[PDB]
Amino acid sequence: KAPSHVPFLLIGGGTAAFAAARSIRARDPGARVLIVSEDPELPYMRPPLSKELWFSPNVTKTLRFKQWNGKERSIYFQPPSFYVSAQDLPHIENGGVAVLTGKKVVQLDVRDNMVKLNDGSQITYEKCLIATGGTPRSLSAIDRAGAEVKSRTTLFRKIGDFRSLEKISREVKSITIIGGGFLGSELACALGRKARALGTEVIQLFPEKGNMGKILPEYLSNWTMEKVRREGVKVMPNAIVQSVGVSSGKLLIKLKDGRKVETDHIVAAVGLEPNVELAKTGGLEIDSDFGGFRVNAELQARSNIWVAGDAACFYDIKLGRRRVEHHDHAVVSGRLAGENMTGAAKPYWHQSMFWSDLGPDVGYEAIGLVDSSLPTVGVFAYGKGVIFYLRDKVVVGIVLWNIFNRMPIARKIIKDGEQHEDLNEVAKLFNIHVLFQ
Ligand SMILES: Cc1cc2nc3c(=O)[nH]c(=O)nc-3n(C[C@H](O)[C@H](O)[C@H](O)COP(=O)(O)OP(=O)(O)OC[C@H]3O[C@@H](n4cnc5c(N)ncnc54)[C@H](O)[C@@H]3O)c2cc1C
Ligand SMILES: Cc1cc(N)c2cccc(F)c2n1
């Protein structure tokens, strides 16, 4: 199936790879692009897997969802008709984009511009993108628990995880989410909606004082925790898991503070590990501070190799070295890498945003360096507001709380890098007419 040579080779079949393929085809008409994906699915977007796909009846099979406005669409970036087969990729007139599903790149040879797949086949390339993303982390307490505890613990990232968990929500009476970040909180609201209708139980526990405490200031994290609780979720903050075992057919979670939680299924949402296995054979540098492949401002690692998406630790000329795990960042960085694979030599400049919805009622957007450890200034009108994240009297990140269609304004504030004497006047740019943390 796989051709022996391809001009553009993209490793990984996710958001960053698809955005690069589209970018290569737009900037280089007639380009021949091969995506190698270890997953069996064609490229698809992940945000709906914890949101819109849960707020729909045949959705598990169709994988179509209604945006909050009402317009329906598919989770796949393009229908299969958009792609061509890998075998025919060298011969089709005006080229195309092919995906080799079910195949993993296991070896990378930078000197000879060659990769080896898990089935032994070898592919040479002229330009290559590493877009391998990451794999969910698991808790040490779950790893040492046993095969039964591990078989009843879900690490949520893929279409298969959505389907297996959606079925579980219709079979068991109690599901426990471990993790207070974006993913855990969105799954809590999603599973909580399903549980109100079926009369089941949803628990969310995490070590922080409130949901997304590592990201939002304490007061807003606490407000968010109460919103999640009003969705029918039992939220247990300040919870550190000591051990997990099976007791009377149920899962028993023992916390360090002495509390105990009985449940039927566990969903672990405790972060991501960048997929950097190819750095060994490839001789590529990994970043010990942020993880991931270390690349420069143009997302380049070596002469004919770029890295994009969750796996790329890059140099932001304005904000410094970073690694970002956002859907839009994978789109922006994948697109940029694609342009640089066709001669652009452009640095990461356009700042990608992220968003989170805890239902169709609570939503927030964000841009830049967003970290609750940074000094923050929040101007609210509760209901809505804007939180500025500061570094040396300069706004380096913004969180928009239930304020939409104003991300271009936030993007400009980060870019301009002004020293603002009155942030209440800057908040007026977001139609907000003050808390510190
Ligand atoms: C459930 C969920 C909800 C999310 N919601 C949001 C949201 O609301 N807002 C937001 O901003 N972000 C959200 N994100 C984050 C966003 O989805 C990620 O930032 C984005 O998917 C990263 O794209 P990527 O291309 O870098 O990696 P991935 O999408 O992970 O793609 C990597 C692909 O490469 C494959 N691969 C890995 N190694 C190899 C190899 N050696 N050979 C072949 N293939 C390989 C992997 O199997 C995977 O198929 C969400 C993520 C998840 C999981
Ligand atoms: C930056 C970001 C924002 C989200 N809303 C999100 C939701 C689920 C899983 C994730 F990894 C997420 N990451």
CATH 3.40.50.1370 fits 362-436, yes or no: no
* Domain ranges across the chain: 5-43+82-135+273-340, 138-270, 362-436
The separation between the first and the last C-alpha atoms of the chain, rounded to the nearest angstrom, is 57
Is 16's C-beta closer than 6 angstroms to any atom of ligand 1? yes
Whether the CB-CB separation of 390 and 374 falls below 8 Å is answered with: yes
Give, in order, the Cα–Cα distances in Å from 283 to each of 44, 278, 307. 30, 8, 14
**405 in a labelled binding site:** yes
Q: Cβ neighbours of residue 209 under 8 Å, at least 6 residues apart?
A: 218, 221, 222, 237, 238
DSSP characters for 169-195? TTT-SEEEEE--SHHHHHHHHHHHHHH
Method by which the model was determined: X-ray
Q: Cα separation of 137 and 215, whole Å?
A: 19
Look at ligand 1, atom 4, and give the residue with the nearest C-alpha: 47
Nearest to 368 by CA among 336, 346, 385, 391: 391
Give the amino acid at 312. A
Query: Is it true that domain 138-270 has CATH number 3.90.50.10?
Result: no
Q: Is 365 in the pocket of ligand 2 (CB under 6 A)?
A: no
> Is it true that 138-270 and 362-436 share their CATH fold?
no
Q: Is 298 in the pocket of ligand 2 (CB under 6 A)?
A: no
Residue 68 known to bind ligand:
yes
Residue 43 is classified by DSSP as P
| Distance (Å, whole) CA 120 – CA 397 | 46
Q: How far apart are CA 291 and CA 258, in angstroms?
A: 34
Collapsing DSSP to helix, strand or coil, 330 comes out as helix
Give the number of the atom of ligand 1 that is nearest the alpha carbon of residue 135: 30
- CB-CB contact of 358 with 186 (8 Å): yes
Ligand 2 pocket test: pick from 354, 367, 369, 401 the residue with the most ligand atoms within 8 Å of its Cβ: 354
Residue 411, SS3 per DSSP: helix
Amino acid of residue 317? I
Q: Whose CA is nearest to atom 16 of ligand 1?
A: 327
182 lines ligand 2 (CB under 6 A): yes
Choose one of 15, 49, 50 to mutate for the ligand 2 pocket test, by most ligand atoms within 8 angstroms of C-beta.
50
Ligand 2 centroid to Cα of residue 193, in Å, is: 19
For the 5-43+82-135+273-340 domain, the top CATH level (class) is alpha beta
Nearest to 154 by CA among 184, 194, 189, 190: 184
Other CB atoms closer than 10 Å to residue 233's CB: what's the count? 25
Nearest to 335 by CA among 20, 21, 14, 18: 20
- Is 39 within any annotated ligand binding site? yes
> What is the DSSP pairing of strand 122-130 with strand 5-11?
parallel
Does residue 354's CB lie within 6 angstroms of at least one atom of ligand 2? yes
Q: Which residues contact 151 (CB under 8 A, 6 or more apart)?
A: none
- Ligand 1 pocket member 36 (CB < 6 A): yes
* 327 annotated as belonging to a binding site for a ligand: yes
Residue identifier of the C-alpha nearest atom 9 of ligand 2: 183
**Distance separating alpha carbons of residues 417 and 400, to the nearest angstrom:** 18
C-alpha of residue 13 to centroid of ligand 1, in Å: 9
DSSP classification of residue 432: -
Residue identified by tokens 């692009």 is 33
Report how far residue 171's alpha carbon sits from residue 364's, in angstroms, rounded to the nearest whole number. Answer: 32
E strands, 222-381, where? 234-236, 241-247, 250-255, 260-263, 265-268, 272-274, 293-294, 300-302, 305-307, 312-316, 320-323, 353-357, 363-368, 376-380
Backbone φ and ψ of 325, nearest 5°: -120, 60
Rg, C-alpha atoms of the chain: 23
The resolution in Å comes to: 2.3
